Design a protein around this nucleic acid. Structure first.
Ligand SMILES: [Zn+2]
Lengths: 178, 26, 213, 34, 243, 40, 95, 35, 86, 70, 146, 41, 180, 234, 111
RNA sequence: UGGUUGAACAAAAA
RNA sequence: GAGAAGGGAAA
RNA sequence: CUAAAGAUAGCGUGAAAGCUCAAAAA
RNA sequence: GUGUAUGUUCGAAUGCUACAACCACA
């Protein structure tokens, strides 16, 4: 129940079919900032590790980043010294079979600047890593801030009340109406 | 300075009244 | 082609690089003060000098504009307001009344436009040999002078080049802004200072940055 | 790439040609990437 | 409206000693207004000042009474604020198609002294209250435009605005030529040019036309720019770097 | 000139422009840094 | 105020009437003159259309005074004699 | 056009003070023109 | 064509175009495009701004149209980065 | 020594609590003038700091890590 | 990014895919069938009450009413004309050229013709409205003026 | 207008094997497999 | 004519040595250093010799020069009355000294005579001193905190040498650790 | 509180999901405690509530609001219970509501909100503050649904190894009339709503036994046969 | 690079003296206050250290006046209630630009 | 808009 | 208006 | 004049000086 | 604009080498 640093799933050293990447059951929602795949693809362990290192370097030691998927699915390739048709090749790499709509990385820190709605999110690390992923990506930020708590609505209502009051005083002072 | 600060201290009551009325109404 | 076939990026990736920006390290801040107020527009009016009448219907009433640009000419015969010739230019959009063409129309017929080039260095001097338009500029001690009578001939009757008594300031004056600018910029292109030696000309308020080996 | 299999169908073929690759390759890429 | 129709001397016939109806209207328009209210009244300022100005220009019999109708403070305020916002906000905005067409015809005919929306007034007036559609100033001519529908086929008539402007221009001493669209639209380009030339023939140049020339350095008119004149290499080494 | 496949504003004085080269070309002009002058 | 509901503090928002009396001969009246100009500016008129502002040049010899009547109905008077940028002048003179 | 119909014409604001050809005055006077 | 016995379909399409060899060179390099009988500057992708609707899929058209739009000229453009959409 | 000297060591309310009071109206009946002035100062400070964070390009660590979460 | 993964991944079908295997000239299904109006006067009166500012919208209302009925309600015609005039009534920012364009438009001429045809239905309570509209549009109609 | 409230005395009941209709009444239109569960509340 | 700019320096009281410490700023400006020191000593008669205090120079295009003098820096005073020769390495996490509120008031009274704060309130000066102490890692309490209450053995007239010794010892120790 | 009145139109007798979708609407079915009633809701109006965050996907408040759909002369007071929406795009495909009746338990996951993070001492000291539980399960029997729960962190200081705000702290936010309560299965004293801890100091834990590797799932929603081999490390 | 030639001259580019007399309270005296602020502004002092600026407050309801004296002697006087700042500048623009050109012909504008 | 124009510029616009 | 990507050349 | 001003966002210096931006006013 | 050339590092580090803090003006 306390916070923990769960160990990563291990690499399965079992030959498996190339197969197809099944679709996502539904939207994946996580508070904070998320980088979400937009098309299906299989991301290599090297690519995931590079993205993690870049995210850590950009954000800093004081901030924590969660890698949502892991490369456990084996993928094989033949040695150049083997002829055609002599069975499947040796394991060559490991991949995560990311569908469309799957979060790759996310940071759970909520945006503190609720009263500054015009300051839109900082996606610096996501921008740094996106052009290197083999998947198109979309940047998301969800902070559980609902419009019922919006401060801009109160600001607008106050401005409207002030305007109405000003027009009322101007009319009264000029005295063209009862 | 004077004058301005004393008057603002006087009017803080009405400022607070307006703020409370706004928040209560909304 | 575009409009009949999709590109690979727009088809497979949905053009996500368009929205993959980081939003920090901006060269400028966004415009947050608009607020979509829906402000009360007003009929602004300006009293330009009567020379604005040089710009006629072709400019005021025949150009396509979002909102009307009203023009009228008040031609009557220390300043008191009433008793002088002027031009009323009005519109619901103030941006129209800040057009540079309206001011150019007056300046062309009244006072024109001017620019200045400044020469620096040892043995750097501009003079006349012996008079206008035989403008000559030397850019050093052992440097032969540059003959520039051709530019004066080019812009004769619409621009003139004046030299300082010390032969270090070249003032280009004229009655067409575009022509004056082009003349000055040719002269500058052609007298531009070498940043390592600093011998030559530079446009006023645009100094060249000294460089070091 | 080259014509005999990379040629796209045209209006009147209903998206198929006897020796064409492009359609199935595009569909596979859309389904599971490359 | 009384000013537009020029019915200055109107009065209720019930009594011989009857005040001017225009004077009554002005008095009852000014009664409930102060100066602060007058500043924001709007069209009222334009109407009052136009009434006073037209009455002064045409000098009718009841001019004195009409002038006494309006408070002197009101007159002073209107006179001093006329050129600020009143006339500009009261005049028609934007463009007129008939005006554009006649302007194009004049440009084709090479009448370079035709001023669009140009005002005219008496020799001693410091402010002008009316604008002519075009003012041909070398010919003492003012071209007005009637884009209204005629009373019937081939029976055009101008609006009250243009009728009052016609009377004002007459008083000022200009000739007034009115183009009626119900007839003008029936013509084509060449017929329009011919008819406009015939119109201008009746008002020959009575003065020299004022030019609005762009300024120039005339003293250099003798300078010659021989573009495509090759660079001459007179001596080696050159003593002068010819361009 | 910095020949690029993409153009970006590197500072507050950069601006986008069209150059009349062999063909029309997009580019970036800068008063501050000559190295900020780009051509797509 | 940006990103805030209520306006930045201003000492004219909740005043009903203000009257500024001052004498052109006495020194240290520039603060009174500046206050008069500000309260007669159209910017104050648009920001606080409720405010009534008046000023007078005293013929008699008396210090610059400001009287204020609040919306609640209270009334106060204050001496406004002072230096303003004369303070900066005196300081640069001292050093 | 929408602003002018709502009442803020080129003479200012009709709600603040009548400017002539007022929307409300004209509605009253052309909706019930008979005694 | 010529000494190149077999070339790609795209290369043949470029080779057949009826334009000057230098505009064709621009088309090959990607600084110009051939579209409906005309040689044009390619459409410009502006970071943070919606693309022209023609370039996006029919289901994505509404979302693209809801994005911010630039209606100025190249000088006014404040976008952080721009490139030719492809 | 002056009476106000005694209260100096007592910490003042931070921008978070002042915003709770004024932007959200939490316990606004007990708001004091000094509190409003402090809120007005700190709000402007935060505005400027966010603007600088957005228009930041150097490697300097002069920005508090809190603003990088905007 | 509106990529619609459900479609792109191959889980759902598209309207275009479905319609590529149908006759080209089938009729689209009317998803929502609401009863059409039985009385046009009230319907177009409500629409006019909603429309006050756009002369394009006012003329479109008249054109639709004309397309539906050859003798629209005379009171509605008078109201439409009054609204069109009030759009240009003496305090707007329109140029006279806009009034001329409206006058030249064929639909405006059809509305004026409809008014002239049954001009005998004008009651005394609408004369000031029509005169105000005439003055505002600067369209002096000698057919109706007598 | 008014808020919809069901009739009195109703209960929530689950049919484990599904609910038929005119289309399912024909044995050719069987739920398949016939012994599988298709819960419906 | 016009003012070239504004310059700042630290000068020891009643000291007139044309040292590089002064030449770094007076040198390029060209103002006569001996004359500047003569005027400085004339102005600093009532101040203890060898007391570093802050000086500001305003030169003009006509080579005229004006200048001003004011008391030593806030942290100079804070370290003096805290008996700490060295400031905190990591202010906000590590504290190295303590000062009292009444002592802050006294330092505020001393500082009140500087021109930048002449019209400014002593309460504000005390708040500024508190801020400087926070930035420098010096704690403030009404009464001396026991953790730093008995450390009044150092001599305020001999802590410059202590600062020099701290410099040398920290340098040597950290360089040895880096070598390790 | 967060109840929303909405206007709908019928899902007619031969139209399909795809037809209503392409008509710019979302198909919805209201069920439970009465007849199954079909309807369609303007897609813009519904997606405004579903995706009420500009940069966010489906909002936790959507499945926790009380909807007041109006159809013909009927008003359905219900809650969204099933939502088919696009994984990537903010598109609503299909919705299934279940009616809410005063007196019977409705199982609603009411969201949590931390708007006062700037007043948190732990956050100001540079430590990581996390909202662990986006929603809290509640059993609601009243005529209304509780609004989102505000988690106040102004008194959340950091002490090692971590500090937590648990459900007992929020217990005071429930209605005074007892119309709503937290799920009985919750242990209020140990269910943590928020954490404050230091990055890089957490203890190590093994992967949970309930972990299912998403790389070895077939298109039918079943584990691949390789997952049952003796050598499968996960 | 694009050079910024033809930058418009400030309201007080080549003005030798400015005097603003007015009565705070007059309905349309905003321009007088604006010009007073501008002529006492710090940037004006930095750019035109030789400018002689003064103003007077009238205790009676009298029209406002502004007097401008150029560096080349030409003098202008406006009733400020009937002009804006740009209108006054355009009405004395010819003399101001003539003086500026005469200056530029001999002295460096960079100063 | 100006033959101003090899990798260079000026005017106007929004 | 579209691999209109057979040729011409069109809004 | 009012009000505002980052232990600093872009320049600049060997180091200083100096300009701009943010904020406020208009 | 101003305490302030804030503290530590540094031969120095004066908003702008690098870290700490990011307070302060009736
Ligand atoms: Zn740049």
């Amino acid at each position: 129940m306390p916070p923990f640093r769960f160990k990563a799933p291990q690499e399965v050293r079992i030959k498996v079919p190339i197969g197809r990447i099944p679709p996502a059951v539904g939207p994946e929602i996580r508070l904070g900032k998320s980088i979400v795949a937009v098309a299906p693809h299989r991301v290599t362990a090297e690519q995931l590790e590079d993205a993690r290192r870049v995210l850590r370097r950009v954000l800093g030691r004081s901030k924590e980043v969660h890698q949502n998927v892991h490369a456990t699915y084996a993928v094989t390739r033949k040695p150049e010294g083997t002829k055609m048709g002599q069975g499947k090749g040796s394991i060559d790499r490991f991949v995560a079979r990311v569908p469309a709509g799957r979060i790759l990385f996310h940071i759970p820190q909520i945006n503190p600047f609720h009263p500054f709605p015009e300051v839109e999110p900082n996606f610096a690390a996501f921008k740094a890593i996106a052009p290197r992923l083999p998947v198109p990506v979309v940047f998301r930020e969800q902070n559980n801030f609902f419009q019922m708590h919006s401060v801009k609505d109160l600001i607008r209502k106050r401005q409207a009340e002030e305007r109405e009051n000003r027009e009322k005083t101007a009319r009264d002072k000029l005295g063209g109406f009862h | 300075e004077r004058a301005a600060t004393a008057e603002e201290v006087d009017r803080e009551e009405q400022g607070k009244l307006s703020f409370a009325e706004m928040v209560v109404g909304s | 082609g575009v409009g009949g076939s999709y590109g690979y990026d727009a088809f497979f990736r949905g053009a996500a690089e368009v929205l993959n920006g980081s939003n920090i390290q901006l060269p400028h801040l966004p415009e947050n003060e608009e607020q979509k107020e829906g402000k009360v527009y007003q009929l602004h009016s300006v009293r330009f000098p009567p020379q604005v009448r040089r710009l006629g219907a072709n400019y005021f009433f025949r150009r396509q504009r979002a909102v009307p640009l009203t023009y009228y000419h008040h031609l009557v015969e220390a300043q008191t307001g009433r008793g002088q010739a002027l031009c009323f230019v009005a519109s619901a959009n103030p941006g129209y009344l800040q057009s540079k063409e309206l001011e150019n129309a007056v300046f062309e017929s009244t006072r024109g436009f001017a620019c200045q080039l400044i020469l620096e260095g040892r043995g750097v001097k501009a003079y006349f040999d012996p008079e206008w338009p035989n403008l000559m500029v030397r850019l050093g001690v052992g440097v032969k002078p540059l003959a520039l009578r051709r530019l004066a001939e080019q812009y004769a009757t619409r621009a003139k080049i004046f030299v300082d008594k010390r032969g270090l300031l070249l003032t280009v004056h004229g009655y067409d802004k575009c022509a004056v600018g082009t003349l000055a910029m040719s002269l500058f292109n052609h007298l531009q200072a070498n940043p390592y030696t600093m011998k030559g000309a530079h446009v006023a308020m645009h100094p060249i940055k000294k460089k070091v080996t | 790439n080259r014509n005999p299999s990379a040629r796209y169908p045209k209006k009147g073929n209903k998206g198929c040609r006897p020796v064409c690759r492009a359609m199935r390759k595009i569909r596979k890429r859309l389904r599971t990437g490359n | 409206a009384l000013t537009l129709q020029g019915s200055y001397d109107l009065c209720l016939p019930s009594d011989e000693t009857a005040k001017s109806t225009l004077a009554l209207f002005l008095q009852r328009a000014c009664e409930p207004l102060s100066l602060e209210q007058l500043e924001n009244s709007g069209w009222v300022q334009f109407f009052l000042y136009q009434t006073l100005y037209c009455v002064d220009v045409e000098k009718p019999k009841r001019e004195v009474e009409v002038k006494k109708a309006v408070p002197f403070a009101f007159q002073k305020h209107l006179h001093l604020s006329w050129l600020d916002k009143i006339l500009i906000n009261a005049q028609p905005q934007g463009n007129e198609l008939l005006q554009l067409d006649v302007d194009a015809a004049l440009k084709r005919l090479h009448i370079t002294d035709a001023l669009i929306n140009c005002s005219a007034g008496r020799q001693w007036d410091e402010q002008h209250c009316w604008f002519a559609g075009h003012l041909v100033r070398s010919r003492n001519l003012a071209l007005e435009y009637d884009y209204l529908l005629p009373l019937g086929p081939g029976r055009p008539k101008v609006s009250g605005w243009l009728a009052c402007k016609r009377r004002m221009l007459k008083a000022f001493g200009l000739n007034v030529a009115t183009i009626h669209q119900s007839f003008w639209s029936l013509l084509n380009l060449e017929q329009k040019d011919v008819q406009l030339t015939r119109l201008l023939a009746q008002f020959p140049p009575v003065l020299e036309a004022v030019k609005d020339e762009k300024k120039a350095y005339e003293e250099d008119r003798h300078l010659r720019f021989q573009r495509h004149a090759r660079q001459k290499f007179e001596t080696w080494p050159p003593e002068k770097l010819e361009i | 000139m910095w020949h690029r496949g993409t153009l970006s504003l590197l500072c507050s004085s950069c601006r986008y422009v069209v150059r009349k080269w062999h063909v029309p070309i997009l580019g970036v002009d800068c008063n501050a840094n000559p190295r900020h002058k780009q051509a797509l | 105020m940006r990103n805030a509901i209520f306006p930045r503090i201003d000492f004219l928002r909740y005043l009903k009437k203000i009257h500024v009396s001052y004498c052109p001969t006495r020194p240290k009246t520039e603060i009174a003159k500046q206050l008069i100009m500000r309260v007669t500016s159209e910017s104050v008129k648009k920001k606080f259309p409720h405010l009534q502002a008046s000023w007078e040049m005293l013929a008699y010899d008396a210090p610059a005074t400001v009287e204020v009547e609040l919306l609640d109905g209270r009334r106060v008077r204050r001496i406004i004699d002072g230096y303003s940028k004369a303070e900066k002048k005196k300081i640069v003179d001292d050093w | 056009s929408i602003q002018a119909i709502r009442g803020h014409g080129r003479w200012g604001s009709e709600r603040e003070f009548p400017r002539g050809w007022d929307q409300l005055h004209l509605k009253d006077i052309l909706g019930s023109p008979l005694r | 064509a010529g000494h190149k016995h077999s070339e790609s379909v795209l290369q043949q399409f470029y080779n057949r175009l009826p334009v000057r060899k230098r505009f064709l060179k621009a088309i090959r390099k990607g600084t110009l495009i051939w579209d409906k009988g005309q040689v044009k500057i390619p459409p410009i992708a502006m970071q943070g701004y919606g693309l022209p609707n023609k370039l996006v899929l029919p289901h994505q058209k509404e979302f693209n149209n809801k994005l911010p739009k630039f209606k100025g000229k190249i000088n006014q453009l404040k976008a952080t980065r721009i490139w030719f959409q492809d | 020594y002056p009476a106000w000297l005694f209260t100096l060591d007592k910490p003042e309310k931070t921008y978070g609590e002042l915003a709770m009071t004024f932007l959200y109206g939490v316990g606004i009946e007990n708001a004091t003038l000094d509190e409003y002035l402090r809120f007005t100062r700190l709000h402007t400070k935060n505005l400027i700091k966010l603007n600088n964070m957005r228009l930041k390009k150097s490697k300097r660590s002069s920005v508090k890590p809190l603003f990088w979460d905007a | 990014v509106g990529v619609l993964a459900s479609l792109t991944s191959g889980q759902m079908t598209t309207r275009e895919y479905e319609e590529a295997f149908l006759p080209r000239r089938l009729k689209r299904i009317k998803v929502f069938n609401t009863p059409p109006p039985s009385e046009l006067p009230a319907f177009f009166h409500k629409r006019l009450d909603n429309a006050h500012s756009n002369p394009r919208s006012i003329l479109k209302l008249y054109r639709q009413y004309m397309r539906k009925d050859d003798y629209p309600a005379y009171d509605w015609l008078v109201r439409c004309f009054c609204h069109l005039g009030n759009v240009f009534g003496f305090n707007s920012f329109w140029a006279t050229k806009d009034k001329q364009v409206i006058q030249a438009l064929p639909s405006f001429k059809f509305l004026v013709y409809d008014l002239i045809e049954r001009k005998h239905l004008i009651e005394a309570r609408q004369v000031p409205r029509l005169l105000y509209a005439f003055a505002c549009l600067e369209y002096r109609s000698w057919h109706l003026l007598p | 207008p008014k808020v919809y409230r069901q009739r009195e005395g109703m209960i929530q009941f689950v049919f484990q094997w599904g609910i038929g209709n005119s289309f399912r009444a024909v044995s050719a239109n069987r739920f398949r497999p016939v012994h599988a569960a298709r819960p419906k509340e | 004519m016009s003012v070239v700019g504004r310059f700042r320096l630290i000068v020891p009281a009643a000291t007139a040595k044309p040292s590089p410490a002064i030449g770094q700023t007076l040198g390029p400006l060209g103002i006569n250093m001996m004359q500047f020191c003569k005027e400085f000593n004339a102005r600093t008669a009532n101040v203890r010799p060898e007391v570093p205090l802050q000086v500001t120079i305003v030169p003009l295009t006509d080579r005229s020069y004006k200048f001003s003098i004011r008391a030593p820096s806030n942290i100079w005073f804070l370290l003096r009355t805290a008996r700490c020769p060295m400031g905190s390495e990591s202010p906000g996490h590590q504290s190295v000294g303590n000062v009292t509120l009444k002592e802050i008031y006294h330092i505020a009274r001393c500082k009140s005579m500087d021109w930048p704060l002449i019209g400014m309130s002593l309460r504000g000066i005390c708040r500024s001193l508190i801020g400087t102490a926070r930035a420098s890692g010096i704690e403030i309490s009404k009464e001396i905190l026991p953790a730093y209450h008995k450390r009044d053995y150092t001599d305020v007239q001999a802590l410059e040498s202590m600062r020099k010794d701290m410099r040398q010892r920290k340098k040597a120790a950290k360089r040895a650790a880096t070598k390790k | 509180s967060s109840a929303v009145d909405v206007a709908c139109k019928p899902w007619k007798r031969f139209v399909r999901k795809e037809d209503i979708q392409r008509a710019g609407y979302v198909p919805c079915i209201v069920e439970k405690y009465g007849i199954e009633r079909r309807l369609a809701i303007h897609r813009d109006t519904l997606e405004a509530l579903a995706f009420d965050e500009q940069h966010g996907h489906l909002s936790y408040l959507f499945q926790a609001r009380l909807f007041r759909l109006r159809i013909g002369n009927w008003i359905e007071e219900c809650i969204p219970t099933f939502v088919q929406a696009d994984p990537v795009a903010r598109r609503l495909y299909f919705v299934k509501f279940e009616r809410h009746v005063a007196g019977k338990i409705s199982e609603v996951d009411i969201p949590t909100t931390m708007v006062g993070l700037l007043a948190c001492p732990a956050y100001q000291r540079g430590y990581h503050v996390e909202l662990v539980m986006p929603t809290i399960r509640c059993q609601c029997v009243g005529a209304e649904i509780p609004p989102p729960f505000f988690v106040d962190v102004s008194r959340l200081h950091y002490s090692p190894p971590y500090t937590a705000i648990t459900l007992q702290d929020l217990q005071h936010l429930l209605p005074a009339d007892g119309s709503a309560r937290f799920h009985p299965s919750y242990d209020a004293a140990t269910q943590e709503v928020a954490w404050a801890y230091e990055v890089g100091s957490l203890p190590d834990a093994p992967l949970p036994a309930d972990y299912v590797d998403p790389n070895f799932v077939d298109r039918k929603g079943q584990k691949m046969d390789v997952c049952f081999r003796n050598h499968f490390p996960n | 690079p694009k050079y910024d030639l033809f930058k418009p001259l400030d309201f007080l580019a080549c003005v030798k003296s400015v005097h603003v007399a007015y009565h705070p309270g007059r309905p349309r005296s905003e321009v007088c206050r604006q010009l007073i602020h501008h002529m006492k502004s710090d940037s004006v002092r930095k750019r035109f250290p030789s400018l002689q600026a003064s103003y007077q407050l009238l205790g009676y309801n009298a029209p406002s006046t502004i007097k401008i004296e150029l560096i080349n002697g030409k003098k202008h006087e406006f009733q400020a209630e009937h002009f804006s700042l740009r209108e006054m500048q355009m009405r004395f623009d010819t003399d101001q630009f003539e003086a500026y050109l005469e200056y530029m012909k001999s002295q460096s504008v960079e100063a």
